[model samples]
Target chain A: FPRTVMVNLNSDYYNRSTSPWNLHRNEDPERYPSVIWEAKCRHLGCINADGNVDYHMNSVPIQQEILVLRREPPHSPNSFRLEKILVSVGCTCVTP
Target chain B: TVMVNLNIHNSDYYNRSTSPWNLHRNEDPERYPSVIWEAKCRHLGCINADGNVDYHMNSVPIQQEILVLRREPPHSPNSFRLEKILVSVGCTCVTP
Candidate 1:
């Protein structure tokens, strides 16, 4: 069976439809650079309001958003890369 | 509860107090009319519209800090309680 996950996106950055000012509009290359992070739930699995899936790896209402900022040389083209990994578990709640 | 952290870099006038722009509307009639004038200095007390510090004219290295405000736990009828407020500031320096 599929698992549930709880995820909390920092209101400061995460938005489904709006791209923040730091990231260039319509240009994927200007987004966050690479770095790696993780979050684990100690309990049940659940779905989030954004419809992203998550698994319950721990107990308590826990959620996390992981950001990865890629390292690159000064003059390299397409040198910046940023990836976000969100994970959580438990019942789904409306996106605040 | 809301916590506002005003990060003031190295400047002749950027402190929370004595900075002309930090006045209230009724506090100073003479200064009130000149609020717009004082705001133009940019290094004085202008809040960056981009939410980032104006590093160029300010001559201060890049700095970032977080202000965390927590509410009283166990929930209360009088809205939320302000548990704590914190302000942290740091600057990036060139390495020799």
Candidate 2:
């Protein structure tokens, strides 16, 4: 999960995995802080080409990730979307 | 620098075009390259108002907007994707 801290989009992982970049390397958080890590899915797809289907596992819970990422600072007024996490999130086929 | 984030929903604009930020003009292309403008619709609603129906404006053909955004150097194996435009995105209802 630490690897995808930047890749919030499932389509991104799919696109990168299947197309020309085909980069199977772990994303470096030192450069890209906003990643999707486990990469949620709509249903079982292939983590391996044979399709055992581990990523997303067809039931990834998102509220936990959201909770883990939030911060409440006495340093300023309470804020929500002020965080860099985008509107591109949530856990579903239509989102994240 | 391009235009309003394209709604692309092809549904209706009553959502925003009314959100108020659209009132400001001028864009910085470096900030928002992958943005949609002109928003599509399955049909028209009311640029002004009508309960019966008023907008998509009818039969514009879908191809005009799809081509302008595709980029590349790939007549060869030189490749793309990592070119970093990332995803040019959707609208108010769209994701841009």
Candidate 3:
């Protein structure tokens, strides 16, 4: 038997502005508020069979929190404001 | 599955030029990012359902941005720089 856990998206986090294909629209807005962003993470997988057992994880559809702001008036140069944000968790299956 | 709840409250507001929230001359030399403080402003609350029937009924707009300016370390009395600028949003839900 396989045990699975899923964390689904609630309606409160939906963003009415962007398309479904955009990645930036589905990230946590509180931490990464900007459109251009970067991050660093250290993790272990693939190299070990035990760790890679669930490597082929399927994608889950979820809604995320979004917010948009203007840094300057309608038209300006070098003016940038924070845009769309989302928060969600992944699902996984474990075999015992 | 795990669930977490967060509750935040504002305690007090003080003059940015004076004690408590006092930002020194160097910390905010030109005061380019002047504080636009609003005290006791309710950031979240319930919506009047009697006004609209088709809508979800509850709505609140979160603050989108915060600008701050201050001197960097190797602290100087005259030298200052913009330290941090932030944009944040909170998620809420409507009851049917």
Candidate 4:
């Protein structure tokens, strides 16, 4: 069905869409490799026809911890630190 | 309420109080505004009607990216750096 949900595990080099100076954007690729996590589905939750519903499904992110390089300005050397970031894992059906 | 108190302080999930940005322990409102005011889950697990704990609620966190001041070496000067952190925004119930 076109409205059905499909799950897949995807991997890519980490980078934040909100910032330009973040670790993955500024650091060398040789130092930091790629990371993996479950990708977000095309649809949120259970789908229905005729635009009707009693409950809504929600897509939530699952987080994991990893070491990332931090680049500071004004000639400061980059440092490594750990941070927890979200990645799409699954969808949950619940009452609105 | 099933959430922790929201208080302002300087700490992360790792419980680290020290950072290179606030080396001199300055409390400037703009740059060195080292504050941690996020809510957390109070209980570790949840109880069912049978008087036994068989499930747990997920304490989901909503994250935000904020610019923080960093102290550069060789006559320390302040520079802005982006950090993505999470705050316990809501809770969800889980069942077996």
Candidate 5:
């Protein structure tokens, strides 16, 4: 059987438009929301498995789009843009 | 065995921008390849033991959301946005 657990993944994103020459990270940490709540597989593999891993089931991640708030240009009005980020929604077990 | 038609089309999110925010875009216009998917047929329905139609099949269209870099407000700035587009990953027989 396949099982999954919800995990909060934290990440940092820097806006390219704010950079002077579009090089390096110049992100203001306080201006952006950078946490993603996603699903992770609980078990390492599936049940009914032999010594050969390929003959048994494999756990795969199901990805979905999620909206997050990101600061494009530091302090302008309506600077925060709703960005779509891809995250693992759940896990599915399938035979190879 | 099932008979499915393979269809090809350009993804709506396929951009030719060289901006750093455009994560997945075609750099070359001449060598760009269109995305291909499987198209369902009308006869792809469930059949009973006696070879009679048990469930009606539909050529349902499936879509997925993707993130792409686009200019906001036409002149504000480039940002990552969500775009829901059609994609046929696989063909399956289903009921309404």
Candidate 6:
């Protein structure tokens, strides 16, 4: 059987003006939030894998827990949906 | 089949030296070819009810035609296969 776990998967960049497909890291991390580290690993538990945790991301403004703008995802994490995800908290429900 | 590796800052490490998720604008772009836009945005062009296109990848060296990793993907694309698809294309494959 295949094991599952949640890890921050950043597969793309996002922006409000565009179709969530055109943003770069140095361009503006603010608009690119959640778009990076947006991988939705399959997992039965809300917990995370043993590694790849970016604790520093949790500090200051990157505190996904406090800064997250949760909204309905086009798809859910179980299915590997990629609209956007918060790698800091390992959750896929985030908004611009 | 997961192709899981050490997951480096170089876009999460692939020993192939990694880059898609790490490195940055301040860094070299050669190391990070596809990690920038590995998003598997959906497209009906594939042969499934669920399919996605990595906005920034190609199998051929920019040749085109169908053998060029046409805009469509194989399998069901049923909201669960973006991971490997993006991997085969040298990207992280997600819908960020």
Most accurate candidate by TM-score: 5
Look at candidate 2 and tell me the lDDT of residue A38.
33
Model 3, C-alpha of A72: deviation from truth (Å): 17
Q: Which residue window of length 10 is worst by lDDT in model 6 chain B?
A: B61-70
Candidates' lDDT values, in order? 0.22, 0.22, 0.24, 0.26, 0.29, 0.20
Badly placed stretches (over 4 Å) of model 5 are: A1-34, A48-55, A75-78, B1-96
Q: Give the Å error, residue B5, model 4.
A: 31
What lDDT does candidate 6 reach at residue A92?
21
DockQ of predicted candidate 1: 0.01
- Local accuracy of candidate 3 as per-residue lDDT tens digits, A1-96: 211111111122222111011223333332212343211111111112232323332112222233333323233232323333333321111111
lDDT of 3 by residue, B6-74 (tens): 111111211110011211222334342333322221223222223222233232222233333243333
Q: In model 6, what lDDT does residue B37 have?
A: 24
Q: Which ten contiguous residues of candidate 3 chain A have the minimum total lDDT?
A: A38-47
**Per-candidate clash tally:** 23, 24, 4, 0, 0, 13
Off by over 4 Å in 1: A1-61, A71-78, A87-96, B1-96
| Tens digit of per-residue lDDT, candidate 2, span B1-96 | 111112121112213221101211223232212333332322322121222333332111111111112223333221112122222221111111
- Report the poorest 10 consecutive residues by lDDT, candidate 4 chain B: B14-23
* lDDT for each residue of candidate 6 in B1-96, tens digit (9 for 90 to 100): 111111221122211111122222222222212233222212212111122333332211000001001111233111112121222211121221
| CAPRI level of candidate 5 | incorrect
Write down the C-alpha DockQ for each prediction.
Answer: 0.01, 0.01, 0.02, 0.02, 0.02, 0.02
DockQ of the two-chain complex in candidate 2: 0.01
lDDT of 6 by residue, A1-96 (tens): 322322233222221101112222222222212343322223222111232333322111111211221211222332221122223212221111
Cα lDDT tens digits for candidate 1, B27-58 = 22221011211121223221222444433312
Q: By TM-score, how accurate is candidate 1?
A: 0.16
- Per-residue alpha-carbon lDDT of model 1 for A1-96, expressed as tens digits? 211111111222112211111222222332222221222222242222344443421112223232322223333343322334332211111111
- How many angstroms is residue A11 displaced in model 4 relative to the true structure, after the best TM-score fit? 15
Please, what's the RMSD in Å of model 3?
A: 22.5
Task: List candidate 6 stretches off by more than 4 Å.
Answer: A1-82, A89-96, B1-34, B37-81, B84-96
